[PDB]
């Protein structure tokens, strides 16, 4: 009873999470095979192909579209949590559950529905023209702008939940002390609230940025061929090209970003606690 759960929970994570990742990291050392797809031959030919401008402009182009989505979520998410903590306690649980209910529909079906709504001849173009605000339909499809709209739409609920927990756990007399000492609201925001809730911001940025760099059906449906994400490239190299070692090399460029972000969470948390 006492020891069974500890071994079992440790045995489950190791067998299913940590051990497969080390092979992925060690899968970029072998060569390419047309049979078992690998061969014991230490090589570094995979990496120099990353620096190719063809394969290097795509990586840079994906990061730009992922950062703007995270910032748009952060501009739209921190204020959203602030108004929720200033509401009666009897309505807070209901409103949180009303943010997860769109999830009862599959993610791939929600994007297709968004495509018809924003189409050129669809709504928001007939209605926006019918009540004169514009003179010609606004075309956003198959543009980098269209991709940003999709990333925000899917991943917005993943940022509100971490911020609400951090905001709700603040000490009310702590914020009140600055007002007495002589700090205004603007001054109170920059020098007290933000440093205290930094671990919440960092955690929320991790749950919206990294998943946004692997969603390939958003680019397939709304981006076109020129606007591709790392998720589209890796899927092709594994299921169609069947070049596993190169796909593993592309994935580490995404894991490296994880390591940089984790250090900031620990040092921001250690400085506060």
């Amino acid at each position: 009873f006492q020891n069974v759960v500890i071994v079992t929970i440790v045995g489950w994570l190791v067998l299913f999470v940590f051990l497969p990742n080390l092979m992925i990291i060690g899968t970029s050392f072998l060569t390419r095979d047309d049979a078992s797809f690998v061969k014991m031959v230490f090589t570094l030919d995979n990496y120099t192909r990353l620096l190719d401008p063809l394969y290097f402009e795509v990586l840079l182009h994906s990061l730009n579209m992922a950062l703007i989505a995270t910032l748009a979520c952060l501009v739209l998410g921190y204020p959203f949590a602030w108004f929720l903590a200033k509401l009666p306690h009897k309505v807070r649980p209901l409103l949180l559950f009303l943010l997860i209910v769109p999830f009862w529909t599959n993610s791939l079906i929600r994007i297709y529905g968004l495509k018809i709504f924003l189409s050129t001849k669809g709504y928001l173009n007939e209605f926006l023209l019918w009540l004169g605000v514009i003179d010609t339909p606004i075309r956003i499809m198959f543009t980098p702008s269209a991709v940003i709209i999709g990333l925000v739409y899917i991943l917005l609920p993943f940022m509100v939940m971490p911020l609400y927990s951090s905001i709700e756990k603040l000490d009310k007399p702590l914020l009140e002390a600055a007002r007495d000492l002589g700090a205004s609201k603007l001054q109170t925001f920059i020098r007290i609230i933000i440093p205290l809730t930094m671990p919440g911001i960092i955690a929320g940025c991790l749950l919206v940025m990294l998943p946004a760099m692997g969603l390939f059906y958003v680019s397939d449906l709304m981006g076109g061929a020129k606007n591709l994400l790392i998720g589209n490239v890796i899927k092709v190299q594994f299921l169609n090209i069947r070049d596993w070692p190169f796909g593993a090399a592309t994935s580490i460029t995404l894991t490296i970003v994880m390591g940089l972000m984790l250090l900031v969470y620990w040092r921001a948390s250690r400085l506060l606690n």
Binding site: D171, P173, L174, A177, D180, L181, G182, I192, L272
Partner: protein, 358 residues
């Protein structure tokens, strides 16, 4: 005349907490507000500090109206019961926060902060986060943060509740000396009779947002105004007396707790009036009655002796069924008053050492 509060009204969630309050605070004194838990003392403190606005009335500070002046422009600092201490700043920066926020030239900031820390004996802890200190050090840091801005009046909100019984006794004297050396008004809020009684020059007793009595500790302890105050502070004894007739301008004869003694009354009385006699436990004389001669005082009994070291207080249960709870001292003539259990006694007081109300 420092702070004048005129006709202040306050409503909270539709419930009135401050019906109508008129209070004047002089300059350069230590004032303590006393009352039971949750009686609007915190509301009054927050109103003076500026975190809330009145629903009616006027507030005057130094003959300048500050009724609607925001919390940013007042020269009053407060030390909180939560010991607000920003956790991501060192002690130096914690003290210097107020100076930096007021746009002070940087050549004077360091000396002022360092002198303020030296005032409260915190020289060594210049750079230590507010999680490496003890409770007393936190108290000192909060006081130094409040008083570094040179305020015109310092507000304390239940300051030393969470510490032990010895550091508490040290810092009571430390605060009284800091107040005397600085020379500014101190306003203190506590639920303890000992601190308010032993630390103040004037005490205001509050109850449901109304002032019961305001005066020096001697007056409040010796000359209460009603039965609530006489019993809220210290320990009191309630004797029911019925006046029979008047002997002279000061003495009257009555039936107190089934017996007939002469009590001192300095106001007009008429026969048949029901009276109240109040007595402190130390204001009571007791003698054993081992022999059959039981007389000279209320009879009572002994139900429980709780000795305390320097003194010994014993509770006497009369024939009617009321506890009396006497207290005695250890003198040269009385080295030890060792009483047995269920032993008959005799109850007496000291002439003219009593207070009678109506």
């Amino acid at each position: 005349p420092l702070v004048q509060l005129a006709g202040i009204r306050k409503c909270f969630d539709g419930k009135e907490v401050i019906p109508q309050l008129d209070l004047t605070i002089n300059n350069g004194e230590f004032l303590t507000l006393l009352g039971p838990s949750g009686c609007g003392k915190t509301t009054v403190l927050r109103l003076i500090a500026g975190l809330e606005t009145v629903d009616s009335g006027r507030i005057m500070l130094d003959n300048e109206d500050i009724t609607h002046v925001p919390a940013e422009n007042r020269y009053v600092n407060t030390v909180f019961q939560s010991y607000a201490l920003f956790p991501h700043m060192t002690v130096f920066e914690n003290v210097a926060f107020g100076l930096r926020m007021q746009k002070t030239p940087a050549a004077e900031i360091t000396p002022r902060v360092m002198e303020a820390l030296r005032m409260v004996q915190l020289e060594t802890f210049a750079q230590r986060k507010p999680h490496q200190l003890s409770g007393g050090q936190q108290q000192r840091v909060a006081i130094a943060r409040a008083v570094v801005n040179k305020p015109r009046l310092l507000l304390l909100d239940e300051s030393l509740s969470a510490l032990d019984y010895k550091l508490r006794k040290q810092m009571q004297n430390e605060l009284k000396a800091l107040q005397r050396k600085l020379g500014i008004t101190f306003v203190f809020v506590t639920h303890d009779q000992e601190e308010a009684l032993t630390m103040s020059d004037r005490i205001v007793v509050m109850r449901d947002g109304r002032i019961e009595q305001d005066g020096t500790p001697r007056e409040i302890y010796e000359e209460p105004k009603n039965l609530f105050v006489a019993g809220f502070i210290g320990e009191i004894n309630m004797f029911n007396a019925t006046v029979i007739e008047r002997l002279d301008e000061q003495r009257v004869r009555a039936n107190v707790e089934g017996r007939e003694c002469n009590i001192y009354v300095n106001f007009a009385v008429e026969p048949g009036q029901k009276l109240h006699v109040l007595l402190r436990p130390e204001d009571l004389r007791v003698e054993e009655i081992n022999d059959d001669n039981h007389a000279e005082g209320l009879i009572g009994y002994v139900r429980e002796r709780n000795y305390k070291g320097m003194t010994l207080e014993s509770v006497v249960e009369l024939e009617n069924g009321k506890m009396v709870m006497v207290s005695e001292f250890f003198n040269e003539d009385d080295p030890d008053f060792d009483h047995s259990l269920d032993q008959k006694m005799a109850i007496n007081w000291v002439e003219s050492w009593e207070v009678v109300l109506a």
